[PDB]
Structure 1
Amino acid sequence: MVPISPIETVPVKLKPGMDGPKVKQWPLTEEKIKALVEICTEMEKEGKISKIGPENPYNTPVFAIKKKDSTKWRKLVDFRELNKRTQDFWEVQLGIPHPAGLPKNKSVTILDVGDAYFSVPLDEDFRKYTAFTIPSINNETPGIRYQYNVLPQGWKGSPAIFQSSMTKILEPFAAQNPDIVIYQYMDDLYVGSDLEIGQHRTKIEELRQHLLRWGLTTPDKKHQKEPPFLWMGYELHPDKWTVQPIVLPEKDSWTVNDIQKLVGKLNWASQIYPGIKVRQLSKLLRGTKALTEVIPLTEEAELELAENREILKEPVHGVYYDPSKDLIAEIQKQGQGQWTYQIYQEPFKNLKTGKYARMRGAHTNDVKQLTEAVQKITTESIVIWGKTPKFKLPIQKETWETWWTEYWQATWIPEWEFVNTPPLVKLWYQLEKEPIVGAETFYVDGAANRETKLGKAGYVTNKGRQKVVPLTNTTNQKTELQAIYLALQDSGLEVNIVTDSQYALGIIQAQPDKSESELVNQIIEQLIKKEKVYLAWVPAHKGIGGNEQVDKLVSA
């Protein structure tokens, strides 16, 4: 007998004020009972479970299931009630590595620690809660009761305690062998390195000689896979990586189950397939809750679907990360809030791709969206590579310089360079800082009755030019914007506009180039045609000449 190092137990407690489960055992058939007694007899002699007496008041129902071809029954303890009463744990398996950040590792050996999963002991002060009773034949004898001595399959804390216990054991080995990387996931250990295979297996056998010191039989995986590894929906080759075959069906009646199908596949493919759109397909996802109704396809969504089909014809592959080279990310505008980017180190070979969707709002511009896309790529790059990449942006240095110096908010973009890839982000209009000399001054105002929704809007100018337009089905805020549009429509290339609308100022000072309101979009189109525009604000109902004259004409 060779001494083994004991695995340190994790102290587990129930939730405060809660007790263990006390669920009645299901009446099982005679064939299931004989199967459960035979397997629990083997699990007991292996030290996984142990018999108990009638003192334990807790109980958990145990079931017996059978597969298709395998003529073998298997137990299944339903710890659903115990998991509700067990404390919360720290899950160390929430995130998944992205292949674009994983470097080259030629030698690879995948081990199976399945027999080590049931070797980690459970806290002895908590084993009494894992009680389960196997019903007796014809209910004529007391049911045989066991309790788990190791981490049970299906328990809340089993995955986290196992990985924590495995990480604690692998720490000295992963520290004294820096040329070896070990990835933990489920009952599998993914070991890789860049050394020749002769040195790899020897260190693999060293890992097998390290885990046996805790008594963990860890051999090679049965039926080792081919070079293209199928790992979390990816195809992992030695020098390249890609996603498993994802092809969209050709249908004519799409329902809601196909709603999470196209979006799920296109978003999962945007990480390697460039230029992928899904917004026109996602706009049909506003208020559909059930999973059976049909939605007719718009030709804007069909054209978008056909554009992605041409990209999904030939498979695109990505390269692995090289820390010796720089990290570069280039962004392109696709239209209507659509943005796509490519991340690479050497040209014509991307590490990964992606897309950014415009944050929905009333008003926006391309500079905000590009800025938001940069912050999204920045955070994603810190996750995968731990560093901010150099950006290639389709915006002039002068355009960005004018933007951030005059924008009312604070804004910043990390180190970037301009790339001439149309369409380019440009400032469509810039308001003046001071009043314009020689330009006609338009005093505008608007008003509307809150009951009948009848309103007026217009302007008065220093040259005697006037206009008042009656409006139907409008509001006070809408007449204030209408008066601005009228002043821009009837003025020359240079114009000074005087308004008292704080609502209209907040929209224009936000500098939008596109909005969901047709009236604001008409104002923007008017601003682009101008050469100089100065917008000035005055307090209303304060005897300001020109402002009160136009106020009484719209107030009826």
Structure 2
Amino acid sequence: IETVPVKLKPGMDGPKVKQWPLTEEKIKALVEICTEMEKEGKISKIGPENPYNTPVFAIKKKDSTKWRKLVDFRELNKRTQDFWEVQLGIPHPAGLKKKKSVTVLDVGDAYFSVPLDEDFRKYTAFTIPSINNETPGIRYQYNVLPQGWKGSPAIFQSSMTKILEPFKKQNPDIVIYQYMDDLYVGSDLEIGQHRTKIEELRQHLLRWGLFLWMGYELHPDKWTVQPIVLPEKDSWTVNDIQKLVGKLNWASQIYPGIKVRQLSKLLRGTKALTEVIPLTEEAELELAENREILKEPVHGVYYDPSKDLIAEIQKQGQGQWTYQIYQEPFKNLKTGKYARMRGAHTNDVKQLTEAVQKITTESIVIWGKTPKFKLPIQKETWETWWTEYWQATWIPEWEFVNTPPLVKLWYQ
């Protein structure tokens, strides 16, 4: 009932971000949702004296046919005062990633029971546009914590902690983490009661006040990690050897002991690319010494909460994608590889958009924050289509790579 005062960062004004074009179907969905949210007091129409704006659109989550309103609070978030609650900043649960399984629950609705600081409301303004802008856009602002806003979990934290004590005390080994509108619940108990502990947690939540019906399971215990491997062949052509030296030269930026002298020696002369070259003793030993080196972990690799996480993605073709997460170049903290028949066999962008969400989810579980993406796609193509395939309540940052990375194959 009482509201916790909020303000932007000293010297910054509220967001003034343009609403992007929405399809007729998304507009209709938003009008219906916002009309209902207005009857419920969650939002209120605003006048022209409010100049701020945050983009809005609509999505359909994991296997449901019901539209969800998603506000793109990325700008408002980086302008919202770092919210240091009475939590001292909950030290990210380094054990969530080790847990056998993890289910992700959408508890954003809970936020709608807490009122928002009146002086801050103006900053959450958004517009439902009209097709061809025939009528003026419907302008609204929030009266309660908005889903997707940084301050929502922070402000509702105190309320959330006491709503779960019965469970946390009843189940001491289950790890529960909260990121934005998501609650990540991890335990080693097999689906049977892991599902029921959630179902128990759902009821427990449904009873303690608060589409919760949805669940999203992950297995961080069996996640995609990636060591560098070299070919094992009985006959090497000149081309095979040139590719190997190129790859080892690349890895030498990651691993110091890598040597190619003995292998490139085999390349002394202008030979036909398809000619088979027998490996010398020295070269074969160098290859063995390099294989061993590649089995040890990368040296001096540590995570740093004060720095951004950077995620690079490469299109490998045939539905496969590789990615690396790091903070320092050549100091990978996590690498992976994807390929699935999930509604995008002829859609490159749908696949990339799905990869972006899995990588972000993985990043939240491991470090408690989202990475900055470097996407192998032209800005105009991505910005035109990503919202058609987005199914998450959060949205990461991204930039575009326009020059083909020579290091593509070395990752697959």
Shorter chain as denominator, the TM-score bin is 0.3 to 0.5
| Cα deviation 1:293-324 (Å, max 9, x = unaligned) | 99999999998886565688999999999999
Percent identity between matched residues is: 99
Deviation at 1:285, TM superposition (A): 24
Comparing 196-205 with 417-426, greater Cα deviation is found at: 417-426
CA contact (8 A) 1:97 1:384 kept: no
Cα separation, partners in 2 of 1:232 and 1:177, compared to 1, 3 Å: closer
Comparing 130-139 with 261-270, greater Cα deviation is found at: 261-270
Aligned residue in 2 for 1:344: 326
Alpha-carbon distance in 2 for matches of 1:113, 1:411 = 11
Alpha-carbon distance in 2 for matches of 1:306, 1:321 = 31
Let me know the Cα RMSD of the aligned residues.
Answer: 20.0
| Cα deviation 1:479-500 (Å, max 9, x = unaligned) | xxxxxxxxxxxxxxxxxxxxxx
Deviation at 1:112, TM superposition (A): 4.9
Q: Does 1:379 align with 2:361?
A: yes
Deviation at 1:129, TM superposition (A): 1.4
Alpha-carbon distance in 1 for matches of 2:272, 2:212 = 33
In structure 1, runs of 5+ residues without a counterpart are 1-6, 217-228, 431-556
Equivalent pairs counted in the alignment come to: 412
Comparing 54-63 with 401-410, greater Cα deviation is found at: 401-410
| Cα deviation 1:517-538 (Å, max 9, x = unaligned) | xxxxxxxxxxxxxxxxxxxxxx
CA contact (8 A) 1:111 1:188 kept: yes
Comparing 268-277 with 83-92, greater Cα deviation is found at: 268-277
CA contact (8 A) 1:50 1:148 kept: yes
Alpha-carbon distance in 1 for matches of 2:409, 2:55 = 68
Cα separation, partners in 2 of 1:305 and 1:88, compared to 1, 3 Å: farther
Cα separation, partners in 2 of 1:80 and 1:32, compared to 1, 3 Å: same
Cα separation, partners in 2 of 1:21 and 1:173, compared to 1, 3 Å: same
Cα separation, partners in 2 of 1:125 and 1:31, compared to 1, 3 Å: same
- Which residue of the other structure, out of 212, 221, 243, is the alignment partner of 1:261? 243
**More contact order relative to length (CA 8 Å, sep ≥ 6):** 2
Deviation at 1:130, TM superposition (A): 0.8
Q: Scaled by the length of structure 1, what TM-score is found?
A: 0.34
Deviation at 1:77, TM superposition (A): 3.8
CA contact (8 A) 1:338 1:356 kept: yes
CA contact (8 A) 1:10 1:123 kept: yes
| Cα deviation 1:398-438 (Å, max 9, x = unaligned) | 999999999999999999999999999999999xxxxxxxx
Deviation at 1:28, TM superposition (A): 6.4
Cα separation, partners in 2 of 1:44 and 1:178, compared to 1, 3 Å: same
Alpha-carbon distance in 2 for matches of 1:413, 1:139 = 26
| Cα deviation 1:449-482 (Å, max 9, x = unaligned) | xxxxxxxxxxxxxxxxxxxxxxxxxxxxxxxxxx
Deviation at 1:132, TM superposition (A): 1.6
Partner SS state of residue 230, structure 1: coil
The structure that has the greater radius of gyration is: 1
Partner SS state of residue 258, structure 1: helix
CA contact (8 A) 1:344 1:350 kept: yes
Deviation at 1:175, TM superposition (A): 3.7
| Cα deviation 1:507-554 (Å, max 9, x = unaligned) | xxxxxxxxxxxxxxxxxxxxxxxxxxxxxxxxxxxxxxxxxxxxxxxx
Alpha-carbon distance in 1 for matches of 2:173, 2:113 = 29
| Cα deviation 1:337-374 (Å, max 9, x = unaligned) | 99999999999999999999999999999999999999
Alpha-carbon distance in 2 for matches of 1:284, 1:322 = 43
Alpha-carbon distance in 2 for matches of 1:127, 1:69 = 33
| Cα deviation 1:254-312 (Å, max 9, x = unaligned) | 99999999999999999999999999999999999999999999999998886565688
Cα separation, partners in 2 of 1:284 and 1:167, compared to 1, 3 Å: farther
Cα separation, partners in 2 of 1:377 and 1:128, compared to 1, 3 Å: closer
Alpha-carbon distance in 2 for matches of 1:74, 1:367 = 21
Deviation at 1:19, TM superposition (A): 3.5
Cα separation, partners in 2 of 1:149 and 1:269, compared to 1, 3 Å: farther
Q: Does 1:104 align with 2:98?
A: yes
| Cα deviation 1:108-162 (Å, max 9, x = unaligned) | 8765535546666533432221112233455554432111234435534345446
Alpha-carbon distance in 2 for matches of 1:122, 1:307 = 62
Q: Does 1:301 align with 2:283?
A: yes
Comparing 119-128 with 298-307, greater Cα deviation is found at: 298-307
